Amino acid sequence: MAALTRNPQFQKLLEWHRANSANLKLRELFEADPERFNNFSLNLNTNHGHILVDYSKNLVSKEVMQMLVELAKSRGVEAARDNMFSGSKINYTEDRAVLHVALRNRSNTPIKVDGKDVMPEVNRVLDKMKSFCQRVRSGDWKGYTGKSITDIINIGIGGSDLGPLMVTEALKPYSKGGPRVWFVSNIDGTHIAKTLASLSPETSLFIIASKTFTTQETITNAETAKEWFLEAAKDPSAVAKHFVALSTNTAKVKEFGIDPQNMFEFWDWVGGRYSLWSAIGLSIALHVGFDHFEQLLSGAHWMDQHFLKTPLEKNAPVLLALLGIWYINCYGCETHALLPYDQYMHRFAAYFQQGDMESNGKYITKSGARVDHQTGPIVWGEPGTNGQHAFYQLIHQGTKMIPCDFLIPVQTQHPIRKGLHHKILLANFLAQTEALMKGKLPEEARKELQAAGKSPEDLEKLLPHKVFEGNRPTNSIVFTKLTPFILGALIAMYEHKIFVQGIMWDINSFDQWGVELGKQLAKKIEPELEGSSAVTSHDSSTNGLISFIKQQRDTKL
Amino acid sequence: MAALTRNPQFQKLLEWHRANSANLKLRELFEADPERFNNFSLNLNTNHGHILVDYSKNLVSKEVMQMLVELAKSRGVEAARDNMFSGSKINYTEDRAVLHVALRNRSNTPIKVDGKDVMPEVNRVLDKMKSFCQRVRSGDWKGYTGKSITDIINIGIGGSDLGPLMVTEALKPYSKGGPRVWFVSNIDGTHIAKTLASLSPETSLFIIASKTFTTQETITNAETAKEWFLEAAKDPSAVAKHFVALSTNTAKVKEFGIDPQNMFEFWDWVGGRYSLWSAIGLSIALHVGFDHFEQLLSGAHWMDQHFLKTPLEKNAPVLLALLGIWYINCYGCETHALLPYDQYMHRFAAYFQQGDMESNGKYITKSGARVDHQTGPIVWGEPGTNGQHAFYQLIHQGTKMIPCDFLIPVQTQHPIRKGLHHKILLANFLAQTEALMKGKLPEEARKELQAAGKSPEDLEKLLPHKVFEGNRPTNSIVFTKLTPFILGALIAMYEHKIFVQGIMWDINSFDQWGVELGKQLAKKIEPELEGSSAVTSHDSSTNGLISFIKQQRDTKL
Ligand SMILES: O=P(O)(O)OC[C@H]1O[C@](O)(CO)[C@@H](O)[C@@H]1O
Ligand SMILES: O=P(O)(O)OC[C@H]1O[C@](O)(CO)[C@@H](O)[C@@H]1O
């Protein structure tokens, strides 16, 4: 077996679920206990806004929460957390520290890796970012024709793309005085082509973002950008005015031809999917200003301290993690929906697809044993209220159990029509979780059908279609306003949720060996596509698809 | 029980799965049979490009496919299809026909509802769309100050938003000479506010898209747009130059204040999530031109005829549906990933979230029986190659089985760098499904680690982490080019897949009762948010969340 399934607290939880989970009905839990909301929610005061984590609409009792907390303790969560924060090499397959918390360590308390405090270098790079942001935003940094920069283009993929994109989207109201920001990520030539079509080489600055600086998509895109730039500038020395790099790989950055002073460094203990807090966040700092970037870091730091100091039973990321374990390992739910009622947060779910799924989509434990249980869920979602008119039909009346996190700011960035739109948004946010919990009883639906003037025959037939079974669990995460600080806290909260789940599953949340095979096979196929010769080196499907490509690529439509 | 589970062909399939499915090994299936690709793929010649549906990397044999086709026959798929196409009222809970196929019926063969051919009215509205598009796109249509229209703004949600958005994104290269198109959908005031900030009332044309013309988000957004417009124009007669409606509800359109000559009608037998082919497609036709819109319809028509006339064993939407049933009802897979290797197709997955999940996220059958089996899956995905760097880790090395559809055009719209980007894109498309199929055996990983110079201790530690179990099934859908015609064919193909699955499950793919409760409860909460008084009328969570909103909404941040 595996560490989790051999754990007696887990076995107790699973046995309790088998015997008792059918007795858990949300409607009944609330009716029996008027203090339920009070006892199953956390109202966090950050001193820069409140974050309410309301987990009361979950299929849990006091006893279940107790069993879950006991499991976190007996799986070593507290010790593992302390090991992360102290610079222990908890990324055990790669023998690396895991120190995204150092990037936003506003206290500047020493954090050592190999006996050396990492904070001076973290702060050196942050200082460099601040100076660069001043130069660019002020207009002092000139392009090759002497004009101020108006557009920033981040080129990167995965962890070097999703964070900066999601955060600049979420913090758009804070971007006054900043350059426009663009994100090129896909190797698909459409991406860079459509981006470059709208830009001038005179006023565009490219940020080449890559931890390794060897990712094929990013380097190829970067080289395409450089070719486009040099077509207009016709001067290799002008590249230094229009290209900067964010990387750990000094040598590869030099090889590409980027100025050493134009390199913003980070470290191997910064995972790509945990990197927006580092040099990788340069496009964020350029767009919304360095002050707002520091606020983002500070919010994350607040949540780091919350995670570090708080007893597990009232520790927000721990509780979210534990509810997830309950649904994944006891109920068997494959997915987790993230439903932000905020258009600015439209890339939040996509971000946590990498954050969660690349971290915990794993099957080998620390001992080398294969898991004999589920690990990370499939994360998905779209902003409310849009989702209500897309897929909530299935959440309400399908055959799947889907834990959902509903998120919303109390205060909107755009209080148009004296707050009318936000009133409606909030009402929908509240009503949907209420609806998911309560459902609609046959007696309720029957009266509605009767009042609608339905015949006895029509009523009979329609009735079951109009019933909502309910008992569908949700979290509601409500916060004062989506400021840089609060966004930072929210992202950090989910980072630590993911960490806790990984520890409980005994997996490594911080490596990504599962991307290797696809990369290897793509390197083999690339040269085979050129020319007219038949490819026979693969299975018949791969060969057949290549044959189709070669036959169809010259056809004129 | 329910129709599917009571069906003897289904029980035979399920029994076969229990006894034999563990013996299906993709790597071995391909090695043993060089004809596998040929026997498990469909190369469709539309005369306007080819669509290759390669389903050979699925966990199926000849026997499995035979059983699935027999099940489709036993479930009356052909008769149900014919009934849809003939105008029978197969939406039985609403007593409506289901006739998105009539919208693109290029043959003009009569299709009757209530004894009356619907084609004359379909074509009348199409002619109106054509005339309007010519007037706007030519610059002839002038705004209230006498300027040509530069911006089109679609206001709508769900079925009145997702189709037009997805298609205008996918067909962006075909939009030269067309006005800019914007989509406003969320009630969240951010959506309309940030859109209006970039527009002039003099040169903006609003399209109010709503089947019912009573949806709160859409009517509120429309009223906000009208107020903004009238603040500038100060003349109610000017509204007729700047607002058009796409609806079935003439009375409510008139009540809003839109001219009857500015209404583009559709019909009750056009489902919202099947509506882009109707008047709802006006923003598509305006953006890319009516000719390209007609090509889109024509592509769908081709696929309709394929679905109608082809034996089930060679019928693309039927086979895709059956493979889906195999994974959903025999393997128990909750999800289905759509992974287009095309940046222009970045909203394709979101579109089929509504199309699939709102259609088949159901639990009551035609007999009135509650299903005792799974219905529609959770649909999700992001375009390749981005997904590879976000969540493919989980697909390769997680604990979930996830059927994936990989899609790509052979010809790119942007063959930059002499085709280099598209070469790399294609290589990744091919490699990923190869990798998912093949995996990497412990002995294969061992040899790789030994070659890398790893010590016996280092090798043994890393080995299990480097193993890929493989046997992960995919479809590869490859097409000559993503033209309007081919896109139309692809969308229709999935529409019919969804139809076939719904018939087999004995559910109604065409209603959506599951959205009612959320709407009702939101109407109740709306007025309660007004004022400072505490709300005690709900469960303690809803009450508590409302208390938090009221306490937090005045804080300065
Ligand atoms: O076009 P309407 O009538 O405004 O409806 C919008 C959407 O809301 C729904 O009725 C409910 O999700 C969808 O079916 C529809 O597409
Ligand atoms: O920043 P890099 O080195 O270009 O890597 C990009 C992405 O590719 C991965 O290494 C593999 O998906 C991610 O972890 C990472 O975020």
Curated annotation (Swiss-Prot), chains A, B:
Keyword Electron transport: no
SUPFAM superfamilies for this protein: SIS domain
N6-acetyllysine: residues carrying this PTM: 12, 142, 454
Predominant localisation class: cytoplasm
Enzyme class at the top of the EC tree: isomerase
Annotated pathway: Carbohydrate degradation; glycolysis; D-glyceraldehyde 3-phosphate and glycerone phosphate from D-glucose: step 2/4
Residues where Phosphothreonine is found: 109, 250
Gene3D superfamilies per the UniProt record, alphabetical: 1.10.1390.10, Glucose-6-phosphate isomerase like protein, domain 1
Phenotype of gene-disrupted mutants: Embryonic lethality caused by impaired gastrulation. During early development, the egg cylinder fails to be divided into the three cavities, suggesting a deficiency in extraembryonic mesoderm formation resulting in the failure to form the amnion or chorionic mesoderm.
InterPro entries: G6P_Isomerase, G6P_Isomerase_C, Phosphoglucose_isomerase_CS, SIS_dom_sf, SIS_PGI_1, SIS_PGI_2
Its EC number(s): 5.3.1.9
Subunit structure: Homodimer in the catalytically active form, monomer in the secreted form.
PANTHER family according to UniProt: GLUCOSE-6-PHOSPHATE ISOMERASE
Family: Belongs to the GPI family.
Protein name (Swiss-Prot/TrEMBL): Glucose-6-phosphate isomerase
Organism: Mus musculus (Mouse)
Lineage start: Eukaryota, Metazoa, Chordata, Craniata, Vertebrata
Gene: Gpi
